[PDB]
Amino acid sequence: FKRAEKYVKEYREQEREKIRLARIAKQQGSFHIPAEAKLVFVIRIKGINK
Amino acid sequence: RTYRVGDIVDIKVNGAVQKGMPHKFYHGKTGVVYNVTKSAVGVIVYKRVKHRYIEKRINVRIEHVKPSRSREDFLRRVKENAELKKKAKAEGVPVQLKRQPAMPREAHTVSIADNKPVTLAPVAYE
Amino acid sequence: MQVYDIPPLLKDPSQGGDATMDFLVQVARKRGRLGRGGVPNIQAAAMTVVTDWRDGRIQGWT
Amino acid sequence: MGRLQEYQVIGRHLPTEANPNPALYRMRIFAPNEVVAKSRFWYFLRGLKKVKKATGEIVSVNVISEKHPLKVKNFGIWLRYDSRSGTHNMYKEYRETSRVAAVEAMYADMAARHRARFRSIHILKVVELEKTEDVKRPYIKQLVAKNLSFPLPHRVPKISTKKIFSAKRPSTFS
Amino acid sequence: VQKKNPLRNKQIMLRLNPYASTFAKEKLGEVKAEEGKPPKVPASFKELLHEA
Amino acid sequence: RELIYKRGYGKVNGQRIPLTDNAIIEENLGKYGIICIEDLIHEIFTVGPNFKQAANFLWPFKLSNPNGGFRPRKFKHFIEGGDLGNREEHINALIRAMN
RNA sequence: AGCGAAUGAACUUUAAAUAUGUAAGAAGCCCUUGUUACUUAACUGAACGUGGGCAUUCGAAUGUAUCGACACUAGUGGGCCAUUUUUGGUAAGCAGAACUGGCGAUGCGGGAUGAACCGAA
């Protein structure tokens, strides 16, 4: 219970912390580049022929 | 150059000497020396046939062979973590020894001051 | 807890005997003191916790 | 292509110890979504300069919306299209309320009239004719003309396609 | 004997995630933004935005 | 979250057993600190130190065909109007249709 | 890319894509010290012995429906077509190599129909 309470917190802060930095850099006169994604889901949608 | 029975060599096949040249399949390959003669040398080179592999013992002259430095990485890396492991155990601070495959880039900012962007057309006219 | 993350671990039977082994395991995963099979090196993290206390990374008094 | 949007794409070469703080290029791109706007940015940039996707990064992507999508503007598009002979310039004009509606009508026009595909059309410049009497095409000038008013002859009724039979014959005066 | 979707029946959801009760009770999925008057976009960002 | 809750299955002694209880997570991944199904969500999403072991414990997800279908020209690039390749955040619309 | 670096595909600070050889520990490393039937001016090399560290990150990623040695036992040892690369030639066809893929032992959906097409076993 306590660990998932902690986990759902960081899901909220990480969204807000990425949002606020793009807002701050915009106002300060800069551009913020988010981190390239560290997780990829791959779905195979075509059969193995030829 | 001195070549010992049982070392890794690279076969380049120079076109200056027409004697003792191999086929173009053994040009630009890497094998192991197993027999040394007065003027030629014998190299075992793996070859691919369909799904399996076959070892072919061919004769290459001295003028076409060259030593490989694939041992250069392995000997350098084996020493390199060994001295650090000696150092890290002496210091009592844990140290990463393996090599990590090039993580994604993190997040940062870019100031537009002194670097006002220039707008480009799809094609260049000037 | 705030210095070294320290999520809520299980105190198990009694108090202190099993909590130290739990608090070292979470510190090993967070700091990076794992094993060859991914196991948490309890001796490494407890040394790393001892490394922090002698260096002053933990606060306390009598 | 579909619900096109117009994106501002800022990109630059990857920073280097020898060359810190790179040139920071910018292009305006008409793309259906973000992932092709980034792809079309690196397509053009590798054509002009040496910078490529592996050696570069995208600084920002921001959509741009019309100032006034409820006012009717005359737009002039200069474009360069590739045919089986070579590259040619055109200046086409269209009457819309937005810049994405300008290029949406452009791609439908070039496909219908010259059989041009998306990878052959280069949108050079899209301008809004801020004042009239700068319109130079006869079809658009025809719409701009004073106290314009036309009827609508031979308007077919909208009869439902599942109403197979009807009793009364339809009229075409509405 | 029968696979049960936690997204369909909330008893298996409460079996797996006990926090699902307090998540719905305190409306964590409807958290509002922090207060504060949002400052206007810089005028320099606007002229960049419609340069050409 | 919906991939693990709905189509989540494990590798316990080489068998595909669904994660119906929190207990079977601990008996196979509890030596890495993963004892709940929220732990497995956290490890997969925010890529952690035990991602090597969590992803292989996860059986490959047997998804269905997408509801509504693919695009008309399926075997072209996503940047060229099709479905093959990298689509970044647009994989979520495909996940919702297939799962 | 540059030659507001030098020099001039045969220019290079740098460096592609793209296929394609070779290595990525404990069955491993280095050097110290001794011998030999081999070799060298010479433990200079090869071999036999000696010493050490790390076994709770033992030295990239991903996967792993086990792997290896020995012995014994059946059926096989034809080709046709296409992509790409490549050698030669014709007025044009065409002929020959190498890789891969399909059909050969393969049913189903589609292309009205179909050995060689598309999807999918």
Please write down the HEC assignment for all residues of A1-50: CHHHHHHHHHHHHHHHHHHHHHHHHHHHCEEEECCCCCCCCCCCCCCCCC
Q: Which CA distances in Å does D148 have to B37, B93, D137, F95?
A: 100, 85, 17, 52
Q: Strands D25-31 and F9-12, how do they pair? A: unpaired
CA/C1' separation E24–G23 (Å): 58
| CA–C1' D154–G35 (A) | 115
Chain C residues with CB under 8 Å of A6 CB are 7-8
B53 beta partners: B48
Q: Which contacts qualify for F60-69: CB closer than 8 Å, 24 or more apart?
A: F61/F3, F61/F7, F61/F99, F62/F7, F63/A43, F63/F7, F63/F98, F63/F99, F64/F98, F64/F99, F65/F98, F66/F94, F66/F97, F66/F98, F67/F97, F67/F98, F68/F97
**Planar angle of CA F69, F70, F71, nearest 5 degrees:** 125
- How many other CB atoms are found less than 10 A from the CB of residue D67? 11
Rounded-to-integer distance, Cα C56 and Cα D126, Å: 65
Task: Report yes or no: E11 and E20 within 8 Å, Cβ to Cβ.
Answer: no
Q: Are D125 and D106 in contact (CB under 8 A)?
A: no
> What six digits make up the tokens of D156?
């077919």
Provide the token pair at F91.
């994989």
List, in order, residues 6 or more apart from E47 with CB less than 8 Å away.
Answer: none
Alpha-carbon distance values, D127 to B47, D1, D100, D113, F84 (Å): 63, 20, 12, 22, 36
E and F make contact (3+ CB pairs below 8 Å): yes
Q: How many Cα atoms are found within 13 Å in the side-chain-facing hemisphere of D109?
A: 15
Which residues of F are annotated binding-site positions? 72
Give, as one character, the DSSP assignment of residue D132. S
Tell whether F71 is within 8 A of chain C (Cβ). Answer: no
Find where tokens 């810190």 sit. D20
Q: Tell me the C-alpha distance between D77 and D72, whole Å.
A: 16
Q: How many other CB atoms are there within 10 angstroms of residue C16's CB atom?
A: 7
D89 has which bridge partners? Answer: D80
CA angle D2, D5, D10 (to 5 degrees): 140
Evaluate if the CB of F14 falls below 7 Å from strand G. yes
> Which of F44, F52, F46 lies closest to F4, judged by CA?
F44
Residues of F in contact with A34 (CB under 8 A): none
Going along F3-88, which residue ranges are E strands? Answer: 9-12, 15-18
Q: How far is CA B112 from each of CA B120, D130, E45, F77, rounded to the nearest angstrom?
A: 17, 30, 10, 34
Going by DSSP bridges, is the β-strand pair B108-111/B65-67 parallel, antiparallel, or unpaired? unpaired
Between CA D106 and CA D92 the distance in angstroms is: 8
What b-and-e string marks burial along D105-131, b requiring 16 or more CB atoms within 10 Å of the CB?
bbbebbeeeeebeeeebbbbebeebee
Distance, in Å, from the CA atom of A16 to the CA atom of A28, rounded to the nearest integer, reads 18
Kindly list the residues from chain F whose CB atom is less than 8 angstroms away from the CB atom of residue A4.
36, 38
Residues 6+ apart with CB under 8 A from F55: F44
Q: Name the nearest CA neighbour of F35 among C53, A20, B81, A3.
A: A3
Header resolution in angstroms: 3.1
Count other Cβ atoms within 10 Å, centred on residue C29.
21
Task: List chain A residues with CB under 8 Å of C8.
Answer: 2-3, 6
β partners of residue D76: D93, D127
Query: Cα angle at D125 between D121 and D129, to 5 degrees?
Result: 130
CA pair distance D2, D5, nearest whole angstrom: 9
Q: Pick out residues 59-78 of chain B having their CB under 7 A from any atom of nucleic acid strand G.
A: 68, 70-71, 73-75, 77-78
Per-residue buried b or exposed e for F65-88, using 16+ beta carbons within 10 Å of the residue's own CB: ebeeeeeeeeeeebbeeebeeebe
Three-class secondary structure of residue C2 per DSSP: coil
Per DSSP bridges, beta strands B40-49 and B52-61 are antiparallel
Which residue does chain A place closest to E33, by CA atoms?
A: A16
Nucleic strand G contact set for C 26-45 (CB, < 7 Å)? 32-37, 39, 41-44
Strands (DSSP E) along chain B, which ranges?
8-11, 29-36, 40-49, 52-61, 65-67, 108-111, 118-119
Question: What residue spans of chain E are helical by DSSP H?
Answer: 10-16, 20-25, 43-49
Chain F 37-56 residues in 7 Å CB range of strand G: 49, 51-52, 55-56
Nearest to D169, CA basis, from D160, D161, D157, D153: D157
Whether B33 contacts B4, CB under 8 Å: yes
CA distance B72 to B123: 48
Q: Do E16 and F21 touch (CB under 8 A)?
A: yes
If one counts every other C-beta atom within 10 angstroms of the C-beta of residue F24, the result is: 16
Collapse the DSSP code of C42 into the 3-class scheme (helix H, G, I; strand E, B; otherwise coil) and give the result: helix
Which residues have CB under 8 Å from B41's CB, separation 6+?
Answer: B3, B9, B33, B35, B59, B60, B61, B62, B65
- The distance of Cα B88 from the centroid of its chain, to the nearest Å, equals 30
Neighbours of B9 (CB within 10 A): 22
User: CB A31 to CB D58 under 8 A?
Assistant: no
Report the distance from CA of residue B46 to the C1' of nucleotide G68 in Å, as an integer.
21
D15 token code pair: 């920073």
- Which chain A residues are Cβ-neighbours of F46 within 8 angstroms? 10
Nearest CA in chain A to F38: A4
Residue count of chain C = 62
* Inter-residue contact A10 to F43 (CB < 8 Å): no
Angle at CA of residue B66, ends B65 and B71, nearest 5°: 130
Task: Enter the tokens of residue E31.
Answer: 């958290």
Q: How far is the CA of F58 from the C1' of G62 (A)?
A: 15
B46 touches strand G (CB under 7 A): yes
For residue D47, the surrounding DSSP H or E stretch is: helix D34-48
* Positions of strand G less than 7 angstroms from a protein CB: 1, 16-17, 21-25, 28-30, 45-46, 53-54, 56-65, 99-102, 118-121
Residue E7 to residue F2, Cβ atoms within 8 A? yes
Report the alpha-carbon distance of residue B12 to residue B65 in Å, rounded. Answer: 6
Q: Which two tokens stand for residue B62?
A: 């001295």
Amino acid at F79: I
Rg (CA), chain E: 22
- Alpha-carbon span B82 to A43, nearest angstrom: 42
Experimental method: cryo-EM
Residue that is written with structure tokens 């006002």 in the block: B116
Question: What does the block give as tokens for E11?
Answer: 């008893």
Please state the φ and ψ torsions of residue D82, each to the nearest 5 degrees.
-100, 125
Residue D99: how many other CB atoms lie within 10 Å:
24
Interatomic CA–C1' length for residue D73 and nucleotide G73, angstroms: 88
Alpha helices in B5-102 (DSSP H): 71-91
Cβ-contact E19, A1 below 8 angstroms: yes
Largest CA distance in chain D: 84
- Cβ(D58)–Cβ(D99) under 8 Å? no
Amino acid at residue number F7: R
Q: CB-based contact (8 Å) between E3 and chain F?
A: yes
Tokens of residue B87, six digits: 């150092």
Cβ of residue D158 lies below 7 Å from strand G: no
Angle between helices F37-45 and A2-28 (to 10 degrees): 20
Rounded distance between C-alpha atoms, residue C29 and residue C35, angstroms = 10
